[PDB]
Design an enzyme around this catalytic site. Structure first.
Site, PDB file in Angstrom:
ATOM      1  N   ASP A 147      -1.160  -6.946   2.846  1.00  0.00           N
ATOM      2  CA  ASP A 147      -0.520  -7.482   1.651  1.00  0.00           C
ATOM      3  C   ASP A 147       0.010  -8.919   1.716  1.00  0.00           C
ATOM      4  OD1 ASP A 147       0.984  -7.772  -0.675  1.00  0.00           O
ATOM      5  OD2 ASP A 147       1.673  -5.691  -0.629  1.00  0.00           O
ATOM      6  N   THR A 148      -0.761  -9.887   1.218  1.00  0.00           N
ATOM      7  CA  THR A 148      -0.329 -11.285   1.245  1.00  0.00           C
ATOM      8  C   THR A 148       0.825 -11.571   0.279  1.00  0.00           C
ATOM      9  OG1 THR A 148      -1.991 -11.993  -0.398  1.00  0.00           O
ATOM     10  CG2 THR A 148      -2.632 -12.067   1.935  1.00  0.00           C
ATOM     11  N   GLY A 149       1.112 -10.621  -0.609  1.00  0.00           N
ATOM     12  CA  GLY A 149       2.210 -10.804  -1.553  1.00  0.00           C
ATOM     13  C   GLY A 149       3.520 -10.226  -1.045  1.00  0.00           C
TER      14      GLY A 149
HETATM   15  C1  LIG Z   1      11.071 -10.172  -0.661  1.00  0.00           C
HETATM   16  O1  LIG Z   1      10.074  -9.961  -1.679  1.00  0.00           O
HETATM   17  C2  LIG Z   1       8.807  -9.470  -1.291  1.00  0.00           C
HETATM   18  O2  LIG Z   1       7.954 -10.140  -0.709  1.00  0.00           O
HETATM   19  N1  LIG Z   1       8.713  -8.194  -1.660  1.00  0.00           N
HETATM   20  C3  LIG Z   1       7.513  -7.366  -1.415  1.00  0.00           C
HETATM   21  C4  LIG Z   1       6.913  -7.017  -2.722  1.00  0.00           C
HETATM   22  O3  LIG Z   1       7.259  -6.069  -3.457  1.00  0.00           O
HETATM   23  N2  LIG Z   1       5.915  -7.846  -3.068  1.00  0.00           N
HETATM   24  N3  LIG Z   1       5.323  -7.595  -4.219  1.00  0.00           N
HETATM   25  C5  LIG Z   1       5.582  -8.554  -5.335  1.00  0.00           C
HETATM   26  C6  LIG Z   1       6.525  -9.674  -5.116  1.00  0.00           C
HETATM   27  C7  LIG Z   1       7.903  -9.558  -5.398  1.00  0.00           C
HETATM   28  C8  LIG Z   1       8.738 -10.660  -5.177  1.00  0.00           C
HETATM   29  C9  LIG Z   1       8.174 -11.850  -4.683  1.00  0.00           C
HETATM   30 BR1  LIG Z   1       9.124 -13.434  -4.341  1.00  0.00          BR
HETATM   31  C10 LIG Z   1       6.783 -11.913  -4.414  1.00  0.00           C
HETATM   32  C11 LIG Z   1       5.963 -10.820  -4.633  1.00  0.00           C
HETATM   33  C12 LIG Z   1       3.959  -7.358  -4.383  1.00  0.00           C
HETATM   34  O4  LIG Z   1       3.298  -7.523  -5.435  1.00  0.00           O
HETATM   35  C13 LIG Z   1       3.117  -6.821  -3.274  1.00  0.00           C
HETATM   36  C14 LIG Z   1       3.486  -5.357  -2.977  1.00  0.00           C
HETATM   37  C15 LIG Z   1       2.560  -4.337  -3.704  1.00  0.00           C
HETATM   38  O5  LIG Z   1       1.216  -4.754  -3.323  1.00  0.00           O
HETATM   39  C16 LIG Z   1       2.889  -2.988  -3.031  1.00  0.00           C
HETATM   40  C17 LIG Z   1       2.103  -1.791  -3.527  1.00  0.00           C
HETATM   41  C18 LIG Z   1       2.830  -0.735  -4.146  1.00  0.00           C
HETATM   42  C19 LIG Z   1       2.117   0.374  -4.616  1.00  0.00           C
HETATM   43  C20 LIG Z   1       0.728   0.414  -4.466  1.00  0.00           C
HETATM   44  C21 LIG Z   1      -0.008  -0.623  -3.851  1.00  0.00           C
HETATM   45  C22 LIG Z   1       0.692  -1.744  -3.374  1.00  0.00           C
HETATM   46  C23 LIG Z   1       2.739  -4.107  -5.263  1.00  0.00           C
HETATM   47  O6  LIG Z   1       3.774  -3.815  -5.880  1.00  0.00           O
HETATM   48  N4  LIG Z   1       1.493  -4.083  -5.836  1.00  0.00           N
HETATM   49  C24 LIG Z   1       1.327  -3.647  -7.278  1.00  0.00           C
HETATM   50  C25 LIG Z   1       1.161  -4.716  -8.281  1.00  0.00           C
HETATM   51  C26 LIG Z   1       1.760  -6.055  -8.375  1.00  0.00           C
HETATM   52  C27 LIG Z   1       1.379  -6.895  -9.521  1.00  0.00           C
HETATM   53  C28 LIG Z   1       0.428  -6.389 -10.525  1.00  0.00           C
HETATM   54  C29 LIG Z   1      -0.157  -5.040 -10.407  1.00  0.00           C
HETATM   55  C30 LIG Z   1       0.233  -4.218  -9.264  1.00  0.00           C
HETATM   56  C31 LIG Z   1      -0.218  -2.795  -8.906  1.00  0.00           C
HETATM   57  C32 LIG Z   1       0.121  -2.682  -7.394  1.00  0.00           C
HETATM   58  O7  LIG Z   1      -1.057  -3.133  -6.695  1.00  0.00           O
HETATM   59  C33 LIG Z   1       8.039  -6.175  -0.490  1.00  0.00           C
HETATM   60  C34 LIG Z   1       8.623  -6.703   0.854  1.00  0.00           C
HETATM   61  C35 LIG Z   1       9.163  -5.292  -1.096  1.00  0.00           C
HETATM   62  C36 LIG Z   1       6.854  -5.280  -0.163  1.00  0.00           C
END
Ligand SMILES: COC(=O)N[C@H](C(=O)NN(Cc1ccc(Br)cc1)C(=O)CC[C@@](O)(Cc1ccccc1)C(=O)N[C@H]1c2ccccc2C[C@H]1O)C(C)(C)C
EC number: 3.4.23.16
Lengths: 99, 99
Positions: free
Chosen positions: A25-27
């Site tokens: 996960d690059t995000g």
């Molecule tokens: C400190 O902040 C972070 O880096 N938080 C992360 C996080 O949540 N990051 N988020 C988003 C984000 C938030 C804040 C910032 Br500054 C940057 C980025 C993601 O989209 C990737 C996770 C994820 O891929 C995890 C996942 C959950 C359930 C199933 C698959 C993967 C996510 O939530 N993906 C979803 C998503 C995001 C956007 C659009 C559609 C979707 C569906 C999922 O793939 C974590 C440490 C809590 C994991």
């Protein structure tokens, strides 16, 4: 190897002597795994993503193997919907985005 | 190009004639941008992340440029922490993970 993004980039990881499936996960700033036991001290942390924040346990200097590549770093444990390998460990195995 | 992950993979995108900063996110299945105006009709979609699910607006066949690469696809709009470029558009620009 080269991982396409046609499907979720799920890979096998080895942690705490257990084999699990996790998402490259690059995000994700951090690495977070579903409830499991880990050695050593830990402190509480709140992490946020889409949907809000969740409370997890933070363990540092944890050994993890991603697709055979060894790396050490902080691993968070809590109510995450899926196992996530974040940038803190992706850097260690030399993972990059290419296009 | 090749993007390392020591820092968040934030890039500039262009949509609706405006530049925005967004995160290349391999963990995201979809692309979700912060509240903005887009043309046409939208449909409802629930997307789940670390903190649970949120309701977003889904617009299809939207023109969006990512790091100079032109794409046309589904873009969700809602209360996201940051603008996120997910796999639906990362595949259109030929992005892959490598290590
Ligand atoms: C400190 O902040 C972070 O880096 N938080 C992360 C996080 O949540 N990051 N988020 C988003 C984000 C938030 C804040 C910032 Br500054 C940057 C980025 C993601 O989209 C990737 C996770 C994820 O891929 C995890 C996942 C959950 C359930 C199933 C698959 C993967 C996510 O939530 N993906 C979803 C998503 C995001 C956007 C659009 C559609 C979707 C569906 C999922 O793939 C974590 C440490 C809590 C994991």
């Amino acid at each position: 190897p080269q991982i396409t993004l046609w499907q979720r980039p799920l890979v096998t990881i080895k942690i705490g002597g257990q084999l699990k499936e996790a998402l490259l996960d690059t995000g994700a700033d951090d690495t977070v795994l579903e409830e499991m036991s880990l050695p050593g001290r830990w402190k509480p942390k709140m992490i946020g993503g889409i949907g809000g924040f969740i409370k997890v346990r933070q363990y540092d200097q944890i050994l993890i193997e991603i697709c055979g590549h060894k790396a050490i770093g902080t691993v968070l444990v809590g109510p995450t919907p899926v196992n996530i390998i974040g940038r803190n460990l992706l850097t260690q195995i030399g993972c990059t985005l290419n296009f």
